[PDB]
Write a protein that binds this ligand. Sequence first.
Ligand SMILES: CCCC(=O)SCCNC(=O)CCNC(=O)[C@H](O)C(C)(C)COP(=O)(O)OP(=O)(O)OC[C@H]1O[C@@H](n2cnc3c(N)ncnc32)[C@H](O)[C@@H]1OP(=O)(O)O
Ligand SMILES: Nc1nc2c(ncn2[C@@H]2O[C@H](COP(=O)(O)OP(=O)(O)O)[C@@H](O)[C@H]2O)c(=O)[nH]1
Ligand SMILES: [Mg+2]
Ligand SMILES: [Mg+2]
Lengths: 1058, 237, 79
Amino acid sequence: GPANKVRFVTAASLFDGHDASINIMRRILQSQGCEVIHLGHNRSVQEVVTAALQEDVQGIAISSYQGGHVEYFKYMIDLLREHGGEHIQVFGGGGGVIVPDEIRELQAYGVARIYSPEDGQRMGLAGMITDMAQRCDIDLTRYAPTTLDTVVAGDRRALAQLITALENGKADPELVSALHAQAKAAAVPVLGITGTGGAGKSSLTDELIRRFRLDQDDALSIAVISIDPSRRKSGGALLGDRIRMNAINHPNIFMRSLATREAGSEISQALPDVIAACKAARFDLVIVETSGIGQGDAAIVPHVDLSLYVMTPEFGAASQLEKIDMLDFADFVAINKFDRKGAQDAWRDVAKQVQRNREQWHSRAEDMPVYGTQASRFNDDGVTMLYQGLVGALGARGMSLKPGTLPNLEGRISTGQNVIVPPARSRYLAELADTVRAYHRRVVAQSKLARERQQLRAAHDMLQGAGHESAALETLASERDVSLGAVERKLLAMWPQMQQAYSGDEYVEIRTGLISTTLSGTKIRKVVLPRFEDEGEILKWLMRENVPGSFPYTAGVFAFKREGEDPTRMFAGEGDAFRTNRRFKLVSEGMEAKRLSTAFDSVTLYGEDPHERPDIYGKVGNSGVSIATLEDMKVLYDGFDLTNPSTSVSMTINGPAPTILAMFMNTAIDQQIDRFRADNGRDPTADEEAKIRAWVLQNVRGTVQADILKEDQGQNTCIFSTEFSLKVMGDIQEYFVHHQVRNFYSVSISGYHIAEAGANPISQLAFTLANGFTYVEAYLARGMHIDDFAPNLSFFFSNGMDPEYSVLGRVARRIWAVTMRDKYGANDRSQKLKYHIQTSGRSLHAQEIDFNDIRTTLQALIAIYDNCNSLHTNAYDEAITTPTAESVRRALAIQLIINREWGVAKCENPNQGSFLIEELTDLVEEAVLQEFERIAERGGVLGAMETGYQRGKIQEESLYYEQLKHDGTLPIIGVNTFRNPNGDPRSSEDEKQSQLHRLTEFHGAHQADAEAMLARLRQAVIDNRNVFAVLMDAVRVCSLGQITHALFEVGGQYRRNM
Amino acid sequence: ISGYHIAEAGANPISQLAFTLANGFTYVEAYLARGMHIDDFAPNLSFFFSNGMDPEYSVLGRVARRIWAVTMRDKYGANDRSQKLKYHIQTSGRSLHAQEIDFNDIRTTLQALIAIYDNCNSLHTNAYDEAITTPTAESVRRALAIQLIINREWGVAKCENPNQGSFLIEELTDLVEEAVLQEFERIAERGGVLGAMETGYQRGKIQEESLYYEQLKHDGTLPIIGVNTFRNPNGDP
Amino acid sequence: RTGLISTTLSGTKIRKVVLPRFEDEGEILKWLMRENVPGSFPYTAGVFAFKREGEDPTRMFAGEGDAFRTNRRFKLVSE
Ligand SMILES: CCCC(=O)SCCNC(=O)CCNC(=O)[C@H](O)C(C)(C)COP(=O)(O)OP(=O)(O)OC[C@H]1O[C@@H](n2cnc3c(N)ncnc32)[C@H](O)[C@@H]1OP(=O)(O)O
Ligand SMILES: Nc1nc2c(ncn2[C@@H]2O[C@H](COP(=O)(O)OP(=O)(O)O)[C@@H](O)[C@H]2O)c(=O)[nH]1
Ligand SMILES: [Mg+2]
Ligand SMILES: [Mg+2]
């Protein structure tokens, strides 16, 4: 494509998980002939710049969708100019966030281009990329040094540019020979790491580097040369090795991503020169990673001092190892992903093969340099064992290094304990699908028997009343009585008594009104019973769709809808704790049913404290409330009695959820302690306070999202390793059990984010239920009684325009009810699936936003029809801006009008009976079960995730949606049809300074107890004790950021996967 | 034969449906007394009902169709073309309020939905600002988008009989139908529509039901979002 | 011929007219007499077999001023 070899560094801004099109802009650059060093999402300026300067790129592409873009790009321009990167051009995404004034401001500041959506429609998507790629079509070898003085001195920016000249072959021959002469005299070890594609080389390399740093106290200068294959046709390349490296962010670590620039070889054609360049730069160790090579490859061997073959337990038969050329030269062999099935057996086959290749029959196979590692696991002892081995090898390879600080332990095999879903239970989703289908087979069988029993006894009476009698009929009828189950027989027996119950004006100690009378005088019954005469139809209906509040709870989990509380629960989250608390009081104004829904800013969502640094500062307060300390949390819910039975608090938080939950619990407790110090005019005693805290935990109502699994399925907002988050999430659930927290739900299992990514209703429902069942299987494998954690499970679904949405809730309820009763044998409280429905954000369009209220009304209606437990209605202008004041009342009026004015809604089961509803229910349910089977044959949710099945399927359904939408096949009123002939088309500066002031004040107040508490927290993780229990005390003297980063030091950060 | 203006005067759905069908049958009896054949004028009969928020509106069309179909076949012995009652539904003008006129689009959507569910022959959707000023070109597009979105985007509407089977629908259908018949009997024992009109029975009954609506609306008993509850803090206009 | 099915984005086939799956011939006859399919006596579910697949004829209501101004608006809208 271009003239020179153009290299880019692409990333999403800090705390910004918006990677929807950063996967597509990388595709285009790779198909125009650019080498893109992709850094993924959630990147600080310091990270992107350090990457750009080392990779020595011509351009940088950043996509900022969370705001705070101005401060971010200004910082990047400043930091670039300061450290010799002023010739690097910075570009901005085509998002509709950066307004025209902010574009001209940044473009004048130093930013190359910031493409407006106006440029999107005009230039085209490929058009913008083409323009951007042509601007960066410059030669960088003219910035390269002509003498080795700067590079040898230690200047890394000179090293990075010297490499560019060598990679392009634009370096003077006399300079190259002097470089190799300097490298030979340097005498530094070069470690080669090769293996198949995706084996975990980059991940393991990162972990090994981490080991080096911790073991030698960052005293070692390590250079890293990673190589990824380049597309033959284009000439460009995808260099996705840096995106894995979490331990290279240090002045002593240097990394350069090289393209093969050959359609065959696995290493760079200029690898020997690039290595010699790093050796001469006085590095202590040089590490080289090759690309995905076949079995018969070993090109890395002559260029390095030591070689490490990385592989997975999946290599087929044992005889295949006799084909792997690299098993003949490898000084070390790492069988990574030792968490997978057959890892143990894989280790012995390889050990025996290496033993044969080396002809060391005088030794044990367990003494071979074959290790079993799990790089995905934080502080994996397996990786450390491999590290210990490598050091000893490099030690005699002429490398001075201090005695280790790491545990010099022994063994070859990883002793992984992170057991989530045991391989024996791998097919759990399939078993569940079998259980539901088994239930339906019984429904048919029993229904047929109930009919035959009735048909006989009826015909017998007709004969006996006509004179002649045939008692033979009774014999067959009595045979049906034994055939009919004890449960089914009781159902038909209670049916007449059931009709008498739902017939009167009251449902009779306690009484409940059954009838609401209209203006016309008509009596509308809350629950309408069928008038079937056939006992086959009665039994069939009673088993498949009973009345609300009876198994399988298809029509709802409760007998009747609650009077005091509507399902309404509206979002709120803006600026600091004070402004949001004002919005909370305004939404709950004049309502006994105080049900709050909290939204946190991107800073809090990633478990970070607000800071002066332009990366974070610009994001504090946007898109959500900034909560950093327990004091902020107290202000957030001041004036509300969290313990009050009519008050429930919802809050959307995932990664840092256990910390936020801990703050909420302390807030709820302190409310009652303050209530006691007021009502009694004295502080409660040691005994009194204990009784208070206990009562608070039991009665506190609310819900925290904390769906970690959904984060590694699209939204990418994960800050902890999935295994660690699941451990702590389990720690939470155990804490709830021990203190009888019966009214708080530990997890709102989301599918909204999934549906927002383009997933059709069936896939959304199927994945969410699957992810829900994964949690169940996880806690069961841990050792929890099903009745202990199942009632604490919440759900979160997205509605929409698709027909399947009308029966989403009822299907979710029945699948849950049946499986929880039959498969897991749980009580009635566990069989009841409670969920929240929020209307489709993907159905709200930017064109003709007034039409959105029509769509949100229809979605709210079926939600209420299908007896949802909680409903949030979107404002019409959410497609363009944030929910305003006038707009949030129109969104709230939708629920109010339906619940109060709409006549059909006076009935609480208007869906039941409908031939369409029941057929759709049957259809959708089966479709979900089949999806359960597809996930189960991939190894369950976790298994499918390692391939990216969910994310892959979602992305497929998204493109299908957008295709038909643009095609006009799928009509969208106001967008692709019925277009308007006339018209073609968030946080105070004080509030930010407030949060900083409050934070530094909080830190000062607990300056003494801070460290001792954080240390206690880390020790809890090391000793595998309950983490949440410590968090209940930690949030009192430690801030959000302090806690998160303490856990980082001991729990590890999420590695950017795919 | 229209019942929109009747409903507009405050008449509840049952009285509206009952009077309109009654007035329709009066025409039939009138033309029959002139000695005309039933199959000659019955297919030329069109109806016009008002929808609204009341539950009975969800089954107004289906009840009107069955009462017509059965009577035209059994009582008057007319052909299939005569047994088919066609009608036009316009949303409630009564349900459109002057306070918070943006909320009216919500109400008009719900009324348009049950109208289309119940297989109406013709539908007119009111603009949100018709409560106050004359409908703007923009306001009339929001009213037109309601029908467009339901007919095109709304998934349940892809099915043409989503009402059928529903235990609520069938019970309401049975209830409403009977209530209408009883009203037929009250008018008949007054001498038919013409006879009742002589005593101002219809006018009288409508005015009674209107005051009952106003009484409950003013009372707060009958909640109206934006009017007698959830009122706008910033100001009444 | 007339299409009975409209397929969704998910692939689900939504039938225009959904029939009951009753086994009791008492329920069948009862349903057939009280609420038959659309376009069959007593036409409870509608007088026509299926809804008109053609776009709904947007009525054009004009009437203000004298005969000339109304005639113009008629001609303009019905262009
Ligand atoms: C990307 C941006 C969008 C987002 O991410 S927003 C996501 C955040 N989360 C949300 O919006 C929704 C939060 N989730 C929740 O509130 C809950 O999980 C849930 C289940 C949906 C709703 O819970 P609640 O409304 O509080 O109701 P509840 O089940 O906790 O009630 C507790 C006890 O009250 C009683 N009750 C409530 N309704 C009743 C009825 N109709 N009949 C009889 N009894 C009833 C009942 O005793 C119940 O206790 P129990 O069930 O017997 O143990
Ligand atoms: N289940 C599991 N996955 C791992 C493990 N180690 C690495 N991975 C993942 O395997 C993928 C490929 O690893 P990668 O670092 O890219 O190796 P490379 O392609 O050879 O550079 C990444 O998504 C890693 O997160 C492990 O020990 N277990
Ligand atoms: Mg890699
Ligand atoms: Mg590589």
